[PDB]
């Protein structure tokens, strides 16, 4: 029965999912033209970049 360690694998899967989501939520646009800070600082002017 490989599913006997339910909680021991569940906590590790939850931690891995939380870390993967926290890392993946950096490439999502929250109202800007892109998700790269360098692109915002390069293309747009300082006022709109702020």
């Amino acid at each position: 029965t490989p599913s006997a360690l339910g909680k021991l694998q569940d906590v590790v899967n939850h931690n891995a999912q939380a870390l993967n989501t926290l890392v993946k939520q950096l490439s999502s646009k929250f109202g800007a033209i892109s998700s790269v800070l360098n692109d915002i600082l390069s293309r747009l002017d300082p006022p709109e970049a702020e």
Binding site: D45, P46, P47, E50
Partner: protein, 50 residues
């Protein structure tokens, strides 16, 4: 606290360049206004005297 008062003559087509965070011929090489400028801009024609 401090009220700085400067004066200068400018062309009519160059008045729109006097703005916080504005580029132009008389906006990047003669007078650079900061992006956090807190003040008033007073302009008036003086063709009858200059």
């Amino acid at each position: 606290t401090n009220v700085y008062a400067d004066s200068f003559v400018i062309r009519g087509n160059e008045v729109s360049q006097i703005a916080p965070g504005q580029t132009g011929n008389i906006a990047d090489y003669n007078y650079k206004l900061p992006d956090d400028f807190t003040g008033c801009v007073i302009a008036w024609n003086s063709n009858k005297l200059d």
